[PDB]
Amino acid sequence: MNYRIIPVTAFSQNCSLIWCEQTRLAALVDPGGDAEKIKQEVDASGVTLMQILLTHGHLDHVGAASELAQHYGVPVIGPEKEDEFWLQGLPAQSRMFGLDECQPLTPDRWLNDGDRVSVGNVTLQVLHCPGHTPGHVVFFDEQSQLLISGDVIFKGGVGRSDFPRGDHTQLIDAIKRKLLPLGDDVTFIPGHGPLSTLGYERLHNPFLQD
Amino acid sequence: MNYRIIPVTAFSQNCSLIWCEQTRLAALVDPGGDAEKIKQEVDASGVTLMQILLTHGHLDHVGAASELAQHYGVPVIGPEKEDEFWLQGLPAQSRMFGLDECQPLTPDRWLNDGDRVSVGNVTLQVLHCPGHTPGHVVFFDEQSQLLISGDVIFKGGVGRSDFPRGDHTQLIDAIKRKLLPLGDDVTFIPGHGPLSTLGYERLHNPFLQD
Ligand SMILES: [Zn+2]
Ligand SMILES: [Zn+2]
Numbered sequence: 311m312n313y314r315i316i317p318v319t320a321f322s323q324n325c326s327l328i329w330c331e332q333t334r335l336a337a338l339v340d341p342g343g344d345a346e347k348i349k350q351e352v353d354a355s356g357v358t359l360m361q362i363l364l365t366h367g368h369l370d371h372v373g374a375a376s377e378l379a380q381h382y383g384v385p386v387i388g389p390e391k392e393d394e395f396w397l398q399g400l401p402a403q404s405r406m407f408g409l410d411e412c413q414p415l416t417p418d419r420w421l422n423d424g425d426r427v428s429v430g431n432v433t434l435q436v437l438h439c440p441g442h443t444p445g446h447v448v449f450f451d452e453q454s455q456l457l458i459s460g461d462v463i464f465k466g467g468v469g470r471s472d473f474p475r476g477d478h479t480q481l482i483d484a485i486k487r488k489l490l491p492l493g494d495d496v497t498f499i500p501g502h503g504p505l506s507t508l509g510y511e512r513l514h515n516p517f518l519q520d
Numbered sequence: 521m522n523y524r525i526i527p528v529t530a531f532s533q534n535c536s537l538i539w540c541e542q543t544r545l546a547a548l549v550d551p552g553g554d555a556e557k558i559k560q561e562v563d564a565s566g567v568t569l570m571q572i573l574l575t576h577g578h579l580d581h582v583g584a585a586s587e588l589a590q591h592y593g594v595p596v597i598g599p600e601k602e603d604e605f606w607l608q609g610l611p612a613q614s615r616m617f618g619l620d621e622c623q624p625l626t627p628d629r630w631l632n633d634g635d636r637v638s639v640g641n642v643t644l645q646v647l648h649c650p651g652h653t654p655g656h657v658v659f660f661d662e663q664s665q666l667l668i669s670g671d672v673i674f675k676g677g678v679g680r681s682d683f684p685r686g687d688h689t690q691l692i693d694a695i696k697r698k699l700l701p702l703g704d705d706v707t708f709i710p711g712h713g714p715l716s717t718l719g720y721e722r723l724h725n726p727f728l729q730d
């Protein structure tokens with residue numbers, strides 16, 4: 311799987327344009343804002359966008375999803391249904407940061423643990439990883455050993471759990487039981503900061519010790 | 521000032537019907553839900569409802585405000601503007617607890633620190649007390665030494681500050697600098713649990729020591 315990271319919004323979130331090398335069929339993961347910047351990269355890359363994927367219901371991951379879905383004529387898929395309250399609360403999310411109103415978002419379909427999403431010949435496995443948000447999912451490409459994981463895990467950190475319905479014990483358990491077993495060699499693209507691997511975090515991440 | 525407490529919603533919130541004894545002009549503070557229960561008490565009390573007052577933007581304090589405002593033909597007044605994001609997020613608030621959708625609420629006017637609200641011959645002084653929510657206000661009747669204070673202070677407790685834009689240092693400072701100086705003899709009607717006085721909390725509330 312090929313990809314391009316597109317930093318979007320004032321929160322500087324790692325939106326991912328991902329695509330199959332043979333078919334050039336593509337997906338956007340977490341198009342958080344800066345819809346024009348995203349469109350410019352998508353259009354200049356020459357790929358065929360087929361879908362928008364959402365890891366979780368937070369503003370900096372979903373702000374441009376509705377505009378891009380309409381622009382390209384593609385579905386918005388994900389996250390898990392427990393984040394519906396966050397997506398319904400997008401106006402409140404944006405108003406809290408003094409930003410322009412982000413409209414409520416209803417995805418074409420929710421995702422569940424164990425779902426398959428096809429990006430041309432790339433098969434993404436969906437893993438439900440709650441703790442940061444109760445509906446947070448991640449996308450795993452087994453063939454390229456690549457994880458697109460939103461705000462579950464960072465290089466030397468983990469997602470905040472002090473939000474409504476956040477749960478630290480739940481988040482750490484999800485990382486250890488669902489992510490780490492995918493293998494040390496797995497690279498992850500987090501929502502913020504630099505990329506890292508699961509192996510490096512297993513042994514160096516201060517939140518994953520004990 | 522006369523009053524009647526009307527426990528509403530599954531959160532068992534202390535909605536207040538308050539009124540002037542001479543004129544029988546009345547106000548509702550925090551009509552949180554159970555709109556029929558509220559209407560039954562208001563109508564049976566014989567008072568003339570003139571206004572709805574809001575201490576803060578949380579679901580269990582505002583759920584029935586819009587229906588009652590329309591039913592009686594009265595304004596919704598308060599809280600302070602910083603809670604606009606909470607009122608915009610009412611659908612998200614209710615969806616989070618698996619309840620029926622509560623619509624976004626736009627009050628007739630926001631309140632500010634130092635505002636006067638007239639309930640017949642009762643003059644309420646408005647105090648801005650952030651920390652639980654950034655737009656939280658309280659209503660003080662100096663003549664009857666009575667405070668209607670929402671979720672700022674409880675008997676032996678204080679409002680949670682772990683919500684988005686919550687701030688514990690700010691909440692405690694607001695209590696100590698804006699509430700306690702009103703006098704030890706002041707009775708308060710909190711959003712939850714039994715009534716108490718400012719004097720008792722000053723000396724016994726574990727959150728107010730030091
Ligand atoms: Zn993020
Ligand atoms: Zn309350």
